[PDB]
Ligand binder design. Sequence first.
Ligand SMILES: O=C(O)/C=C/C(=O)O
Ligand SMILES: [Mn+2]
Ligand SMILES: [Mn+2]
Ligand SMILES: [Mn+2]
Ligand SMILES: [Mn+2]
Ligand SMILES: [Mn+2]
Ligand SMILES: [Zn+2]
Length: 454
Amino acid sequence: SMFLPPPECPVFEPSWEEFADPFAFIHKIRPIAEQTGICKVRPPPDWQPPFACDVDKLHFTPRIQRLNELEAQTRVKRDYTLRTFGEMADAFKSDYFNMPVHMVPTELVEKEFWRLVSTIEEDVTVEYGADIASKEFGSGFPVRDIKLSPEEEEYLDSGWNLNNMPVMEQSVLAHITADICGMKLPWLYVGMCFSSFCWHIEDHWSYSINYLHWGEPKTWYGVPGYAAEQLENVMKKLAPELFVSQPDLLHQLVTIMNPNTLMTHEVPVYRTNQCAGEFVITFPRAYHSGFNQGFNFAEAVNFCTVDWLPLGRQCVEHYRLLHRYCVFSHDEMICKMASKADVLDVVVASTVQKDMAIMIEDEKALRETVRKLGVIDSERMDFELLPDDERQCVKCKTTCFMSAISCSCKPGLLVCLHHVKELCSCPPYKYKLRYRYTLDDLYPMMNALKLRAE
Ligand SMILES: O=C(O)/C=C/C(=O)O
Ligand SMILES: [Mn+2]
Ligand SMILES: [Mn+2]
Ligand SMILES: [Mn+2]
Ligand SMILES: [Mn+2]
Ligand SMILES: [Mn+2]
Ligand SMILES: [Zn+2]
């Protein structure tokens, strides 16, 4: 009547055998989980990575959150220790409900969350130790360093240790040399009751995986990848200010929005309470949001499998159409892998090869098109050496790598080959095609991949 909880997302309890390789398991559940956007994974009962930290030596400054449905917030936006945050968090929840914190039913905190965010008269604010970069404060998982206990050593090399998962073989973001520290390094989240994360999808439509180390549950809502644009259409009509164009990736606009609103518009939505020791996995382009039930501690990281590669290319195209900034060049990543074809996993090699083929056929067509526009002069250019802000298309902000157009008239400016007419007002013959590779360089790179794929 007031809040109708979405149906539960899938929950998986893998045997030790299935659990042994996370990527195999994720590929296995994919047909199910991608229909719901998020899923929950319970590790085998004895898989218990030790969390050990001094609650007095980790400091952080949390984000302040107003709890206001449809109100805009920035995706990335007073000082606490873990102990002092915990004391604040427990007292807040305790005083809010006038009860002990583990007597407050999760269904009631959920009902109450959606009540207070929709009520203008309430101005509840909370704090969230969010997007704490694990570089400074350190992972909740064991990492190599002082001296580690034998049980910690058991978990050092686990695939499910979220420090490992980025840099494993079945992962694609591994051999990226470019700076993508926002997508390779785990983030830490210190939650309190009602602290929340707005509806979003991951950069470049990657997967994500979120582990709750300890504390009270984290409540999730998720939408499957296929419904991403449905969700966005619903959201555009109700909160169009979220969809205005805007510079940098440091300001993307996001919001809290009731799942029942989406369900009313026939957008499929699923839910779960993630408890301590459980993983949530989000699939490519799966919108998700949620809130914490109480004091807790989670750790999350992005990753990319071979399944994702074509979506990665589609995302960058979609970014271009939106005039949105890229975190990295997808083509640059593909070529880097091609250049390391001999040491690639063979299934990876085979999949990169397929994407590269499309890349090369698209590049060929784009180059013919700009030649017919009267761009004649050309010069090779090592795009990967340019800082990103020095190789974005003036028009669509895409990060150039395969090629770009420059002009003597507007020195330093580039456009991608889609936006040749947007570079300057000089005639075409004054333009130059800057290219990383000739077509003849490219076919051997692809063929290296083919030999490796056998
Ligand atoms: O725990 C968080 O706030 C992060 C949610 C996510 O993985 O997007
Ligand atoms: Mn307690
Ligand atoms: Mn409110
Ligand atoms: Mn996320
Ligand atoms: Mn997008
Ligand atoms: Mn355009
Ligand atoms: Zn462009």
